[PDB]
Design a binder for these strands. Sequence first.
RNA 1: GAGUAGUUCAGUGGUAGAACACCACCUUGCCAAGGUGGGGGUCGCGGGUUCGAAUCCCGUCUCGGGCGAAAGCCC
RNA 2: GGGUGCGAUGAGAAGAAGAGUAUUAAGGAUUUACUAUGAUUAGCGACUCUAGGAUAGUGAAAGCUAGAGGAUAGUAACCUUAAGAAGGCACUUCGAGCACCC
Length: 81
Amino acid sequence: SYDKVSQAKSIIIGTKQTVKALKRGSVKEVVVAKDADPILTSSVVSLAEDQGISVSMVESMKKLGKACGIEVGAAAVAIIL
RNA sequence: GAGUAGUUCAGUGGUAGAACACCACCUUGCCAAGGUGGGGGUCGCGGGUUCGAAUCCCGUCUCGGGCGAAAGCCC
RNA sequence: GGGUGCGAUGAGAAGAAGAGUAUUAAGGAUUUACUAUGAUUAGCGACUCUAGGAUAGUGAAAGCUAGAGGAUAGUAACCUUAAGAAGGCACUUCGAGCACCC
């Protein structure tokens, strides 16, 4: 949901920073794009599903980053609430 | 008059030069640079003159160009 | 404020390598090669020998080709000492603008 990402209080942008955020489990929701490379997505959805956190899948990664406030797009973004 | 190496130019009778690129090793992270080493050329082509022709002579082709009614000529 | 190129398929900062390497020296060492030079005088042109070649003049010996052999320095290669760097991808965190043009 692009709506939940555009809103929310505490978010984090980028795959590396989202997995690093998963390494402390201070994240409430995880939003990942489907059109992104699976080599980069599987790595985060594995740990996400392992932690027991909810895993969402969205269409485009461009509109994702657009919803995050960034101006280039993001492969994976986590709401750290 | 122009024509020579991949290319840009030189070379005005003593066997073909420079850079830039291609290649090797330095240098296995991948490069790039760099430092060395190396390779490559019917001088447009065939004659001719000469010990010898990228040079000069004649023929020939292309192209630029200029004179011309043209065929042709000049650089 | 205007215009493009790129960026969570990771901008840009930093570190880490890179590396005590490439290199400048101060030497040491005296072979490999690399290139440079062969008195005068003929002579445009000459390290020496071999083999061919091919040769007009000058010449004791000539310009092509292939080997082989000599001393002079200058190199780069093994050491030692003192100095001795660096850009990009990729690593490693921070994580968003960097670059060129009026």
